[PDB]
Amino acid sequence: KKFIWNSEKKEFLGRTGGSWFKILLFYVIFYGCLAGIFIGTIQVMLLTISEFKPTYQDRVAPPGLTQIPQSQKTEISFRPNDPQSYESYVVSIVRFLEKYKDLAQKDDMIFEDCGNVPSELKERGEYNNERGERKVCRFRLEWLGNCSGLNDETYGYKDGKPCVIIKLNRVLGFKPKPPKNESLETYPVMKYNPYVLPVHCTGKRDEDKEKVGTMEYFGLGGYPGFPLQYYPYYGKLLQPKYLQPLMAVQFTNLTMDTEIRIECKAYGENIGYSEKDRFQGRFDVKIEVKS
Amino acid sequence: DPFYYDYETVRNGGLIFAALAFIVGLIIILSK
Amino acid sequence: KERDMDELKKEVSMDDHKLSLDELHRKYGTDLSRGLTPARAAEILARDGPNALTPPPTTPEWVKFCRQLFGGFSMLLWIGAILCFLAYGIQAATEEEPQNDNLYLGVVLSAVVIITGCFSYYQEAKSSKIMESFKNMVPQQALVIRNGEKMSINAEEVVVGDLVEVKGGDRIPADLRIISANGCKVDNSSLTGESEPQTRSPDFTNENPLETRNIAFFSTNCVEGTARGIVVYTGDRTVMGRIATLASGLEGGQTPIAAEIEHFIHIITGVAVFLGVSFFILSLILEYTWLEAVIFLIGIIVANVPEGLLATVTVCLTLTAKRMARKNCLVKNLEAVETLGSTSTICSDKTGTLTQNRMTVAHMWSDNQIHEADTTENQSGVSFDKTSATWLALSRIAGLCNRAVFQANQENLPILKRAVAGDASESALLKCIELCCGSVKEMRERYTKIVEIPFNSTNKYQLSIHKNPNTAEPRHLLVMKGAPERILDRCSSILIHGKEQPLDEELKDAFQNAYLELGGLGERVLGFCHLFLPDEQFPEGFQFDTDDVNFPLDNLCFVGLISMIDPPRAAVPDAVGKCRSAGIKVIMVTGDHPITAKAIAKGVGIISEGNETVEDIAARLNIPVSQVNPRDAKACVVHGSDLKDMTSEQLDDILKYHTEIVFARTSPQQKLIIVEGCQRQGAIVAVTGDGVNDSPASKKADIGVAMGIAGSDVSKQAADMILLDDNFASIVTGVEEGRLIFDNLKKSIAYTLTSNIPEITPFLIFIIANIPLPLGTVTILCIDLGTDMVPAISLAYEQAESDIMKRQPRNPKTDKLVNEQLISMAYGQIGMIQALGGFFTYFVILAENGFLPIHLLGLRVNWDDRWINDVEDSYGQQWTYEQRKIVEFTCHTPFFVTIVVVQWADLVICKTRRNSVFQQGMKNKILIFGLFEETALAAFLSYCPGMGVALRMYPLKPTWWFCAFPYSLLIFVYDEVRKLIIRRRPGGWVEKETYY
């Protein structure tokens, strides 16, 4: 019963030739119309959204806090001697900071020198296209002291006492609001509370907090945070080649050959947190400089 | 702020809808 | 070596009954008048076994439970669960932090089979338990003569070779060899199928030990008289004992419904392995290693298995079996409910199944006119004219001159189904006078009997003289009855409307042709007459002792004839007409005489009027039967004597060229051979019987139908369906429901099979286009085992789109349950629109949050990664792991809602296979609730507090519920116009490709 392949009365794979043609023709017409219909409705869907703003932005309510060494498990384990042990980190740091060089930010028609001091927010009108392509405030590598250097093609970073910069999740129209001067016990920080979003790192428990000896923060003018002069974001279409603020953190007094946990928590009113997303607002890292 | 969605009103509406439709279906199968 | 044991049982029994009185006692070593000594009796008691059939083979309850966990469908779900744990074994040991999805599915697939097994087992067990309340096993003690003394002992305490005596009313214990009888008539109804009471004569009469009269049989009741006999066979070695053991050692076969389930699995797994393999190779060609490719193969093959379809199918069959039990038509088998719908050839028993197996007065001859009395079982027929004087004169002859009376508790019982003591003929007469002529209680005592003459061995006549109570004539009334040929010789006067006339040959030959008319109709006719004795010659004080000629035997006044025969049941003729109307070939298989079976077949519908047999054509042309061409005979009577000398090709030729066949005088084994001959044609066969001879016929048949009360227990246990009410029209209801559930099954299946396309397409393009997952696993379980459960069940409550009892029975080789058209529709067209409807909602949600569809290509690489918390969208926003995972789960929930939205239209279009929805109508209240419950449950699974915590199903923004609206309306309009062209153009294109 499974040799219905052919017969002298015309059957192939089960049916005749004329029948295979009729069915194939019908299915092609049917599926072609289905494709045209899905395309028409999806086109209506594309027309219900604008090019300058996403319709829904509440799923990104609390901005994240990422780092440069995008580790496989947010862990930094290497050898202070072996250069190939920390190659995966440095390569990513150089590739990330490759767009921050003084030669990359050279055009004066798309770049604007914000300033050496964090100032108030810079609102460049509304989000429509009535205005041309907005300007992006510059951010030179010199602001992150001791974690920038004037190295060659390879940024000779810190072997002992490594560096880990943090970055605030770029959100369209997001206006960061640092905490009020009535700081609810925010771990010694500078008095530049009004024009910079604070970010303070710490251990996680009585053990990690003791293992981590001294931390040194670096930012715009020396403040541990992100300046408000770089916000809000106006999308990639209106602001291409945009440079979000950066802030470096170096762990000087570390206990070598011991994995210790660090939590860099960003503070502010417009910065939420989440017990399910350890990256919303806060940020975790597991450092271990094994020699 | 545009970064907030009244999910509670929609959720409350979805549950009332899920309650009214179920009791109506129960009235449907009990034609008396 | 059981192959030889079954063959020595399929053979007709043999005997040594044809022996002289001296030789039998020499062979068995038994005294003819004293039996045997009690010690010799207990020796054969402890030698071979007590006189009782070996109990049936007990079926433990854990056996049939593990049976319901296996099968053909559950086997598919079992191999699927095995693939789930195998795929889980590969995923756990090879990658980091494995997900519990596949294992969550393996435990779910296993639970599906266990729950279905517990439910189906509760239903079949519930069917067997009520059957356990029907075994009214009443021990019956026999009268055995031993050591010259009569002793009443248990039936099991009887052995081989000893004298046994039976009384009129006593049931024959074992197979006896009659040695001395006296007007003893035994009831061979439940065994050989002989209707009228066959007398038992000590002398050997027929070679066949069955037709002979010197043999009493197991499970046969002595109607009247008494007789002696020597036990020949005992226990299982008896006649009906070997027949029962044969029924227990026969194969049930493969039901057609199960064959359709298996044929369904062949296609499901054929396309499942096709997609799994083609995508496995495509996956290895792209970039995925062998490690991930094997999981793709298993995931694609397993996801193509209808999980929720086993429960919907089992419940569908259960729902129909429920209506079977409502009308007292129990089915011990849950799937045998569909077997009647696929039936194309019914093999019915005559005595006990078609007929009532009870002698009843049929026709009467009065005033040279034939009057038909109501022979129905419920008295729902035309009543004869009961006002003339000839009827009163005849009714007194029958109601008075008869040895039949009612018993003690026979008061509240109906006039027909009540017990009556006496001969079968006298019982029919008493039940006719107690029903049409008032009552026989005060009518019998109204005429004080003086001298009676019982039935004689020769010139069988029964007469009696009574006093006259009329307030006009004091002349004694003498009544007499007998055979028409015996009473014609003892009469000269004739009654007509009250007055008398001579024996003129003009009306005398008119009585003779009426005698041949009621006789040729297969009935038994008796002649009744009465005469007024002269009170001037025989005064009121003269005693006419029964010695010499005190009453004039001749010159009597004949009133009329009275015929009688076992009539068919009430709803039997119309039911036969309904089965032949649907196109089922009806063939009577019985062991009765051909003279009565031919008439019953003509009276029930098996033999149509006008159609002639091979013998009727020969009788019409006054030529020998060997001249006519059997092709000129539409119907034909097959005698059992000639069936013994036949091959398989000859039986095939009898069944092909003859539409109306009646097998008469066929042994139980021959009934089995006839059933096998009909199955050789490849047609579905249903056998309906009542006696033990029908046990091997109801067991081997695809389905056996037994009577709940008028049928023996053996044939009742070997059958697959029991008629508790014995109403034969239940067969018509069974075939109707059997075809209706089959079509509702096609609908219920195409419904669950349509949802497979949008359940698998997300995972397919997930691998193809490298896009994030559009539909999760938990969300798929909420569709197959959640929302769609009620619509698939409510789809069973559907009615007929036309007249099902008008179309012809399905062809097992052509009309399959799941053909290539159903797949062309569900998997090809409808499921296709549902899959595109899901992807639309998917892109809508992603594009409105910032992830345009064009930006979603190749994004799953950094999307499913748990540590890249800065995945860029189309607007440049950076999304962490849980933010975008929150969007993906709130993108799976609306995909699930999209499935429900398109299932609205899919349920409405699968609801009707040919007619428009406006034609059939949404009157199915369970289907309306199937939609309300589906919608409320879908909204509840998304908006309940904690759904994103337990099932990862976040609430939906109210704008997503309308993303799938145009697709559902499209599905509805396209299928409606499809059914419309099927209506206006029923030729071939729109009907042979889409109509399933």
Ligand SMILES: *[C@@H]1O[C@H](CO)[C@@H](O[C@@H]2O[C@H](CO)[C@@H](O)[C@H](O)[C@H]2NC(C)=O)[C@H](O)[C@H]1NC(C)=O
């Ligand atoms: C950046 O690194 C330099 C070393 O290259 C640090 O310079 C040392 O600073 C300490 C005081 O903290 C002096 O006592 C040493 O003499 C300095 N050494 C050299 C070689 O300059 C410098 O402090 C670091 N900058 C910051 C902000 O920590």
Ligand SMILES: *[C@@H]1O[C@H](CO)[C@@H](O[C@@H]2O[C@H](CO)[C@@H](O)[C@H](O)[C@H]2NC(C)=O)[C@H](O)[C@H]1NC(C)=O
């Ligand atoms: C840097 O950390 C070291 C510990 O690794 C500190 O020095 C230790 O001080 C304790 C007393 O509290 C001594 O018992 C250890 O022997 C010291 N170890 C070494 C290597 O000196 C040191 O004080 C820290 N320095 C700063 C600036 O935080």
Ligand SMILES: CC(C)CCC[C@@H](C)[C@H]1CC[C@H]2[C@@H]3CC=C4C[C@@H](O)CC[C@]4(C)[C@H]3CC[C@]12C
């Ligand atoms: C084809 C038609 C007749 C089916 C009728 C049912 C339709 C109209 C119903 C079924 C489910 C319904 C949705 C149920 C749940 C939600 C969330 C709630 O907080 C707002 C109402 C909203 C958005 C409803 C819109 C209308 C809706 C889609």
Ligand SMILES: CC(C)CCC[C@@H](C)[C@H]1CC[C@H]2[C@@H]3CC=C4C[C@@H](O)CC[C@]4(C)[C@H]3CC[C@]12C
């Ligand atoms: C991921 C992508 C590339 C897979 C595309 C699969 C498409 C092209 C396949 C899947 C199922 C197929 C159909 C399966 C059922 C039928 C009915 C049959 O008697 C003829 C083949 C026909 C008409 C096929 C046409 C092509 C089809 C729609």
Ligand SMILES: CC(C)CCC[C@@H](C)[C@H]1CC[C@H]2[C@@H]3CC=C4C[C@@H](O)CC[C@]4(C)[C@H]3CC[C@]12C
């Ligand atoms: C021939 C005619 C009937 C078909 C017309 C197509 C209609 C029914 C389709 C085409 C595009 C569809 C709309 C596409 C865009 C939006 C915005 C979205 O977030 C919700 C779905 C919604 C609201 C759809 C509703 C139904 C819609 C208007």
Ligand SMILES: *[C@@H]1O[C@H](CO)[C@@H](O)[C@H](O)[C@H]1NC(C)=O
């Ligand atoms: C906050 O308060 C301190 C003193 O408590 C003061 O020196 C500082 O200027 C204040 N800053 C603002 C922004 O008010």
Ligand SMILES: [Mg+2]
């Ligand atoms: Mg019978």
Ligand SMILES: [Mg+2]
């Ligand atoms: Mg499924």
Ligand code: NA
């Ligand atoms: Na069977």
